[PDB]
Coordinates of C-alpha atoms and ligand atoms in Angstrom, one line a residue:
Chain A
X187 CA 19.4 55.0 18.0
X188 CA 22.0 55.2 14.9
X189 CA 23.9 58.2 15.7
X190 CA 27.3 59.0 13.8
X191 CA 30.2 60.3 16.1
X192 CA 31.2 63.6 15.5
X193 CA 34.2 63.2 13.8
X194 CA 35.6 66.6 12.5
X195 CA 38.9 67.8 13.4
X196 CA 38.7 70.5 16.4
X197 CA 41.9 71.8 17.6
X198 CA 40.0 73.7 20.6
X199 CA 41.8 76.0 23.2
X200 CA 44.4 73.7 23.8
X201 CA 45.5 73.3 20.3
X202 CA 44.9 69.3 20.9
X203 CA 47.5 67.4 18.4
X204 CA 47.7 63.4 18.1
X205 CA 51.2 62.8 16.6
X206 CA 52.6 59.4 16.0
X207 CA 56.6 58.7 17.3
X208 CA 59.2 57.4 14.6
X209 CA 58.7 54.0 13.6
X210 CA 60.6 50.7 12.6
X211 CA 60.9 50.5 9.0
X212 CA 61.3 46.9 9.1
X213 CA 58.8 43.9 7.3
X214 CA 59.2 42.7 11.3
X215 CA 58.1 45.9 12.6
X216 CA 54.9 45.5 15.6
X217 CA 53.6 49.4 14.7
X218 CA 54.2 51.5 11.8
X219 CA 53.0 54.6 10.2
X220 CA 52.9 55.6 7.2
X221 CA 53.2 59.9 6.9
X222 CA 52.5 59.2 3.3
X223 CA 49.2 57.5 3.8
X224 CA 47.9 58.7 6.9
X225 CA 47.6 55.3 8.6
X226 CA 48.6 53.7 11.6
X227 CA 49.7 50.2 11.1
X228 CA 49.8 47.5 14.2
X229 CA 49.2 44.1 15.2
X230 CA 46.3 42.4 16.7
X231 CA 46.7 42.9 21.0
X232 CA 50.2 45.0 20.5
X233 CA 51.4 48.7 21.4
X234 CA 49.7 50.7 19.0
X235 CA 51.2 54.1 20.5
X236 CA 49.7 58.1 19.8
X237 CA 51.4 60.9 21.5
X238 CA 49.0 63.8 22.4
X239 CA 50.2 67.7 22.3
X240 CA 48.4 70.5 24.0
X241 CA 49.7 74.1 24.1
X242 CA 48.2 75.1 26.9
X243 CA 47.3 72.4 30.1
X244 CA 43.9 71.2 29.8
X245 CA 41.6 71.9 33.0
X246 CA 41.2 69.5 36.2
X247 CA 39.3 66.4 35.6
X248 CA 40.1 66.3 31.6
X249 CA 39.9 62.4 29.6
X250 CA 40.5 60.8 26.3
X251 CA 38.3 58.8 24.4
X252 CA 39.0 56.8 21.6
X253 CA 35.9 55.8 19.7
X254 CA 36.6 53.3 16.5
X255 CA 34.0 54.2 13.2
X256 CA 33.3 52.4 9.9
X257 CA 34.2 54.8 7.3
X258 CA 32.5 53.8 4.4
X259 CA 28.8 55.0 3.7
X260 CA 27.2 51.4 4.2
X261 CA 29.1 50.5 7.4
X262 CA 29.3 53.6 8.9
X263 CA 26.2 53.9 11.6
X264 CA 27.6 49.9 12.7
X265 CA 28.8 49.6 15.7
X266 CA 32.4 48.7 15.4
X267 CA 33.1 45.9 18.3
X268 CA 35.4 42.8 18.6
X269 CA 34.2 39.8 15.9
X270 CA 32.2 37.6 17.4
X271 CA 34.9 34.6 17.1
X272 CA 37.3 36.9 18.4
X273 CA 34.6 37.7 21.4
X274 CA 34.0 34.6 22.3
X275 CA 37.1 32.6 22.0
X276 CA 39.8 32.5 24.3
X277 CA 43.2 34.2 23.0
X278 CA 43.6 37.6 24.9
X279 CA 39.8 37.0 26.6
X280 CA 41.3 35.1 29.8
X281 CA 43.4 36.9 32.5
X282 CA 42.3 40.3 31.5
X283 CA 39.8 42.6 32.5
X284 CA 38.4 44.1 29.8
X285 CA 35.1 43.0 28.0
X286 CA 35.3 40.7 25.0
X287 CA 33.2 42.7 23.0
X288 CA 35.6 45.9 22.8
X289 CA 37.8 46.5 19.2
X290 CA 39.9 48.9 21.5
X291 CA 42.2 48.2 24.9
X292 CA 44.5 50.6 26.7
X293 CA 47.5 48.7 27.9
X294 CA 49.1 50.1 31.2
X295 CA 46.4 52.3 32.7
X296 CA 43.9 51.3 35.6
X297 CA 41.6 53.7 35.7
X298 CA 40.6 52.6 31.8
X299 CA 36.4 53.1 31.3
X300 CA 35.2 50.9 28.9
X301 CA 32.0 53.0 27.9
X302 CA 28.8 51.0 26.0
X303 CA 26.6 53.6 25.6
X304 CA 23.1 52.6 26.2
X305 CA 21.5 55.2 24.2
X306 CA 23.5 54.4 20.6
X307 CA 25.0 51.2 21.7
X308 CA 28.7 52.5 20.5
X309 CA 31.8 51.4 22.3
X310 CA 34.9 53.5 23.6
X311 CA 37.6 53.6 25.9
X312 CA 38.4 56.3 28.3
X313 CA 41.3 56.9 30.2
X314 CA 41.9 60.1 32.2
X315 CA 44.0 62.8 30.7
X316 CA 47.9 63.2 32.8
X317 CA 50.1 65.7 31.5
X318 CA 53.2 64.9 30.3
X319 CA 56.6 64.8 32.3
X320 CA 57.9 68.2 33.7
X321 CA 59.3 70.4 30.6
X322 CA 58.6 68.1 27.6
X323 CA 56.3 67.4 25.2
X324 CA 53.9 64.7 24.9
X325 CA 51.5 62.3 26.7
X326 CA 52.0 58.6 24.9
X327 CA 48.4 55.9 25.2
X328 CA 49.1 52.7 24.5
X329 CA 46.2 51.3 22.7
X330 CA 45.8 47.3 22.0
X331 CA 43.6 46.8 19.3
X332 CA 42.3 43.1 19.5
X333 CA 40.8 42.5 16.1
X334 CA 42.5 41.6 12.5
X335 CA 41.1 44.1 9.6
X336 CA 40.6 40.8 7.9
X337 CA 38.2 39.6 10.9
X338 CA 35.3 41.6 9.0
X339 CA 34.2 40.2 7.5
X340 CA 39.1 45.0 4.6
X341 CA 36.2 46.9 6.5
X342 CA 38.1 50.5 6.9
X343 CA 37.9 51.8 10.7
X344 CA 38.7 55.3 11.7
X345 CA 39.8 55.6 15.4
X346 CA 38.2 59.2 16.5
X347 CA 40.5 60.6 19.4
X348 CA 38.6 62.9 21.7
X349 CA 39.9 65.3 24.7
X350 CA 36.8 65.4 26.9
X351 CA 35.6 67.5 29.9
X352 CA 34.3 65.6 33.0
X353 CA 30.6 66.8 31.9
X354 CA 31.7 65.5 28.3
X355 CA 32.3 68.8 26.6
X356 CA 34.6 68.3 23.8
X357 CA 37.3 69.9 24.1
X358 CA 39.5 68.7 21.4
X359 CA 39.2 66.2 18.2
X360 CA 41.6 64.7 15.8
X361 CA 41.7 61.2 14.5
X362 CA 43.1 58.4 12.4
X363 CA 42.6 55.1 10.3
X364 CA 44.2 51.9 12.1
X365 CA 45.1 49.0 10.0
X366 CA 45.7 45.9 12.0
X367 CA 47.5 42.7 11.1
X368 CA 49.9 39.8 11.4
X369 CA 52.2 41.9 9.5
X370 CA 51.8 45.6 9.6
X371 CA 55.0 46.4 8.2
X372 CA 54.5 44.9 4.9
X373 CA 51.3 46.5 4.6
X374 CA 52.3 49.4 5.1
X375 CA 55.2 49.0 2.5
X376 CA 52.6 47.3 0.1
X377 CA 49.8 50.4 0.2
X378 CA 53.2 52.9 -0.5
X379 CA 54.0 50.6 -3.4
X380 CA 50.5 50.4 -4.7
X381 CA 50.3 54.4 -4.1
X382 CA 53.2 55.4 -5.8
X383 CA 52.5 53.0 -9.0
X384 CA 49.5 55.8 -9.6
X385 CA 51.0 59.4 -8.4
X386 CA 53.7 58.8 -11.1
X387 CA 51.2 58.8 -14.1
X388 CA 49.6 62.7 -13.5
X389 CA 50.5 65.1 -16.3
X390 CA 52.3 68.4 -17.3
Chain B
X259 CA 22.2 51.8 -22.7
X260 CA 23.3 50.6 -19.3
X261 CA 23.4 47.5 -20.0
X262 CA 25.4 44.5 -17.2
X263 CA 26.9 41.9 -19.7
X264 CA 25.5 38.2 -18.3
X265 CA 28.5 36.5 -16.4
X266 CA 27.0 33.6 -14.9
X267 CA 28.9 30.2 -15.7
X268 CA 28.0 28.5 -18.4
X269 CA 29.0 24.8 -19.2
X270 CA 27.6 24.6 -22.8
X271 CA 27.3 21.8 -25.0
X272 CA 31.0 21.9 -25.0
X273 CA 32.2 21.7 -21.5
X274 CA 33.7 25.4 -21.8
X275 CA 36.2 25.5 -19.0
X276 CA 39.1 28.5 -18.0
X277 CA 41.6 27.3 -16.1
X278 CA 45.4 28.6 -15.3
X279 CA 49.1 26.9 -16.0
X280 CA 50.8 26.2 -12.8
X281 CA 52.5 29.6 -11.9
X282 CA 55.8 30.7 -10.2
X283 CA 55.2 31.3 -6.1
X284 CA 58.2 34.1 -6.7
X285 CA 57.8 37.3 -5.3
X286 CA 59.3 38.0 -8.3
X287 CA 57.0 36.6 -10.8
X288 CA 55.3 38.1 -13.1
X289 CA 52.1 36.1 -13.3
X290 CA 50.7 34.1 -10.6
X291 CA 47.5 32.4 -9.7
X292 CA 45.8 32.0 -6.5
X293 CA 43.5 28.9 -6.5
X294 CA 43.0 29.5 -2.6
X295 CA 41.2 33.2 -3.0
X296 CA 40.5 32.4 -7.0
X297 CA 42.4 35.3 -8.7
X298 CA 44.8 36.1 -11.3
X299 CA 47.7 38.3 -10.9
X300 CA 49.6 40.0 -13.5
X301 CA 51.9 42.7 -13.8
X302 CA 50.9 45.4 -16.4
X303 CA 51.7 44.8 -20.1
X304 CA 53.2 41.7 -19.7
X305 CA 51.5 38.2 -20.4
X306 CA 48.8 37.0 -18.1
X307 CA 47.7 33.4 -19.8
X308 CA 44.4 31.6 -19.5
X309 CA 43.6 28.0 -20.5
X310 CA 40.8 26.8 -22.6
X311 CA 39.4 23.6 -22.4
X312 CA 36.2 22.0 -24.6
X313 CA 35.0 18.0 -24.2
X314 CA 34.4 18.4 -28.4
X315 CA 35.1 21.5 -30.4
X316 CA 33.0 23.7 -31.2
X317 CA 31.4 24.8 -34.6
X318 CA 33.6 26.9 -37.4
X319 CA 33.8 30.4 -37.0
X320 CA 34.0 30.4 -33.6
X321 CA 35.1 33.2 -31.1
X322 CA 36.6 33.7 -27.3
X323 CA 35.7 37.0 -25.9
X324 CA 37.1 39.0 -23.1
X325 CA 34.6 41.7 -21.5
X326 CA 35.7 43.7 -18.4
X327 CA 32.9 44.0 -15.5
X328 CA 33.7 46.1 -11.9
X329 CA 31.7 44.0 -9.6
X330 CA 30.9 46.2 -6.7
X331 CA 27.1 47.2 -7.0
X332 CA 28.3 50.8 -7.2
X333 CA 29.9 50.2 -10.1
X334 CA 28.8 47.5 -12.1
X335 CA 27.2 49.6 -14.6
X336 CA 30.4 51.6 -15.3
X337 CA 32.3 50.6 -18.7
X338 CA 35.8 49.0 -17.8
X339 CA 38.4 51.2 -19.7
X340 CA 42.1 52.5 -19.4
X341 CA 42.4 54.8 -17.0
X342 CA 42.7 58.4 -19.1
X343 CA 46.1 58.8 -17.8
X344 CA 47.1 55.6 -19.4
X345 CA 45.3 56.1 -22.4
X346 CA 46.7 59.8 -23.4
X347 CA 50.4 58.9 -22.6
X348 CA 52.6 57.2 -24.6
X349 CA 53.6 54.3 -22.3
X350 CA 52.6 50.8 -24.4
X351 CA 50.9 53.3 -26.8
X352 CA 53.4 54.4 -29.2
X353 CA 54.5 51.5 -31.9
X354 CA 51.1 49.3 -31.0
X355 CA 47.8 49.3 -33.3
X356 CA 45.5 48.3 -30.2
X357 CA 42.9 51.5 -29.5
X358 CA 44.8 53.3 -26.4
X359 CA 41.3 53.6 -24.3
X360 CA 41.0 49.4 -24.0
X361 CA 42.0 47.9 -20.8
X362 CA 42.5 44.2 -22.7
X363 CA 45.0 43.4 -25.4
X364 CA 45.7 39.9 -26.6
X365 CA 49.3 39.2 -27.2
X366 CA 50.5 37.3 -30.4
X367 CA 47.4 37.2 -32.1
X368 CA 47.1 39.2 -35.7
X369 CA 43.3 38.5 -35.8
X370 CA 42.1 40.4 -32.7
X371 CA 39.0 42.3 -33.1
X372 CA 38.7 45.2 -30.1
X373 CA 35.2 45.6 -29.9
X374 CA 33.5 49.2 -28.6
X375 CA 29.6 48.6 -28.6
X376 CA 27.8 51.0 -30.8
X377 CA 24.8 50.6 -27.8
X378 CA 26.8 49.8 -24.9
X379 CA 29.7 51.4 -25.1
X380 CA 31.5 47.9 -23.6
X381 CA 34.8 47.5 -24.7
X382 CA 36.3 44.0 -24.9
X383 CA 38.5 41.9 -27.2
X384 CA 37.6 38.9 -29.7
X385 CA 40.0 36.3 -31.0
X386 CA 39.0 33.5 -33.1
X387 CA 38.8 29.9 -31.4
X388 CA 42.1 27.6 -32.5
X389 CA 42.0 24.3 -31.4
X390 CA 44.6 22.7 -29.5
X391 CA 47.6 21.0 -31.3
X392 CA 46.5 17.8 -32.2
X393 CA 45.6 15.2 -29.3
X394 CA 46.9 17.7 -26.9
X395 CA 44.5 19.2 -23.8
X396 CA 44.1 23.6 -24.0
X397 CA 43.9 26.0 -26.3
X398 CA 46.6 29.4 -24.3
X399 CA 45.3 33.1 -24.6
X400 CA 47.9 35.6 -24.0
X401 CA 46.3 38.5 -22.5
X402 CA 47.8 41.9 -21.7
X403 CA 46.0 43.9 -18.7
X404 CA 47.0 47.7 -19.9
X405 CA 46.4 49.1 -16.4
X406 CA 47.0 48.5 -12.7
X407 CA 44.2 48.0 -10.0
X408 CA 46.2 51.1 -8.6
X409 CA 44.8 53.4 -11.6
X410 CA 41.3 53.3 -10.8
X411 CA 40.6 55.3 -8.2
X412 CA 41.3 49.1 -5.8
X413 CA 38.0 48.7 -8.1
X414 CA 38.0 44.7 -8.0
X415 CA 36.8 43.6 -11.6
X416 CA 35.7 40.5 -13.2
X417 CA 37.0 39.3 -16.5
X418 CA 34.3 37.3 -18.5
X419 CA 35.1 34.7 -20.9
X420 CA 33.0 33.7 -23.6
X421 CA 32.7 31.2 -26.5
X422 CA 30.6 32.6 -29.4
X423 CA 29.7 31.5 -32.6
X424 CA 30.2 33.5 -35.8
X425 CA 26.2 34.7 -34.9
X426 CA 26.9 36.1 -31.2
X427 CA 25.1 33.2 -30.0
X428 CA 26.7 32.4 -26.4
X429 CA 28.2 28.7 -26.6
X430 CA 30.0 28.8 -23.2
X431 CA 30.8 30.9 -20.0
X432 CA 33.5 31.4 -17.5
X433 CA 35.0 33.9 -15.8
X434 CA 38.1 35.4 -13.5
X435 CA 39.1 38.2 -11.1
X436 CA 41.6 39.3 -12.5
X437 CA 44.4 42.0 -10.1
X438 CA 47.4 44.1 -11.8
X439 CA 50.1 45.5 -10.2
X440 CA 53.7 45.8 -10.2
X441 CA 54.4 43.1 -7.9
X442 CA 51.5 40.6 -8.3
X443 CA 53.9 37.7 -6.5
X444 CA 54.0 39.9 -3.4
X445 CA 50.2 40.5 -3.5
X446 CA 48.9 37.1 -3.6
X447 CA 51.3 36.1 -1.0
X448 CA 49.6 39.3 1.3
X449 CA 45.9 38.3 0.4
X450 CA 46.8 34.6 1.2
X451 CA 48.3 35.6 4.6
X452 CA 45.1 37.5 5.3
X453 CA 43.0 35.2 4.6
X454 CA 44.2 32.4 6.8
X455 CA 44.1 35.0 9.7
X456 CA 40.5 34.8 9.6
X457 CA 40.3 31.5 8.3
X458 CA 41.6 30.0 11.8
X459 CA 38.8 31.8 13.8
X460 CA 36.2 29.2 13.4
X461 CA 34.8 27.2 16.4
X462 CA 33.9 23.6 16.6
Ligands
LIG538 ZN1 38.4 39.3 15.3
LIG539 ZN1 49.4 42.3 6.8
LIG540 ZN1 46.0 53.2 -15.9
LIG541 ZN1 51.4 44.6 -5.9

């Protein structure tokens, strides 16, 4: 059963980019990211926004996946799902559709598949691939993450992005880590601290 | 010679306790303890006190010892040293006697021993045991924690303090997680935050 996502970065015929817009540099902030780090930075059930490039248009019938992975070597054939007093509670469980058990929700699109795959267990979210508006240049997904980092139990989670074909050919890959909190912006102005404390003290 | 110094508590015949002043809840400070998530936070090079406590004192020639440990399984076997960067500079280096590769210096003590095990290769730091002034409660340490969390790669370690007699014969145990960085008020204010997140998720 254990199976580890693919995970390696694939550009594919398209040229598939995930991009992240500017962001607040504010301690009040809801989303930020950190160029320096790498990370995306949000709050539990919030817009947590990527912007996907292609060069070319991908063919009919095209989706996106995003599939959430441990990272470290222990954790990383877990399933990554919702905590279980998260899953079983009540704050953002009633009046919405989506199952309990999911880390990841896509906020304004109805045609959302939540995928539980019955041969590894692992949990994604698929939404169908539209193309951006006439002459520019991205297509935005809203994802809603609905768990805390400090819910399990900081367990790092990368968030694999995947442009899929109907038959579920893989078309393109990138992906980032998602750090999610009460208060994303100070994280995020915390790890650059931290990091910069140690990039001063190399040699020459 | 990979040896794990012992850390579990130990009491003694003397009641050996560590405790901490009360500290500033700055963001500013530059020491601060958390009793909430039981750790120390300094700022590097600057004074990071413990208190010791004993119900009857202990025999002459007595010592207090401070041993760095990593306590991750991965790397509990690694010795605890400055990080080389640190240790080949001339930052806190230049104008001080205390050997450049130790993590631990003791501040306004003349009889400090640093230790480097001929078999272990563990480094720690030895004072003599001085009472407290007479009919008052703790004998203060001033240690000095010669590199950040941030250096190494965090590595959480665990500071071990001992009570020995002249012999090496272990009279008491306690010990501390101890966190540097350069803003130690603003990290145990994050880590707190964090914690009660998760703490609130329990069901009745
Ligand atoms: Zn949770
Ligand atoms: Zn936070
Ligand atoms: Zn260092
Ligand atoms: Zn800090």
């Amino acid at each position: 059963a254990p199976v580890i996502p693919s995970n390696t970065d694939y550009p594919g015929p398209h040229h598939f980019e995930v991009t992240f817009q500017q962001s607040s540099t504010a301690k009040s902030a809801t989303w930020t990211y950190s160029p320096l780090l790498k990370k995306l930075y949000c709050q539990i059930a919030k817009t947590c926004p990527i912007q996907i490039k292609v060069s070319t248009p991908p063919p009919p019938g095209t989706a996106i996946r995003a599939m959430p992975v441990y990272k470290k070597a222990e954790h990383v054939t877990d399933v990554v799902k919702r905590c279980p007093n998260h899953e079983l509670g009540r704050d953002f469980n009633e009046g919405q559709s989506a199952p309990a058990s999911h880390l990841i929700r896509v906020e304004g699109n109805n045609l959302s598949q939540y995928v539980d795959d019955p041969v590894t267990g692992r949990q994604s979210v698929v939404v169908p691939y539209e193309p951006p508006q006439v002459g520019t240049e991205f297509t935005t997904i809203l994802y809603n993450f609905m768990c805390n980092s400090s819910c399990v139990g900081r367990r790092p989670i990368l968030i694999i992005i995947t442009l899929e074909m109907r038959d579920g050919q893989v078309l393109g890959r990138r992906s980032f880590e998602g750090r999610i909190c009460a208060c994303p912006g100070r994280d995020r102005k915390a790890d650059e601290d931290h990091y910069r404390e140690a990039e001063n003290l190399y040699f020459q």
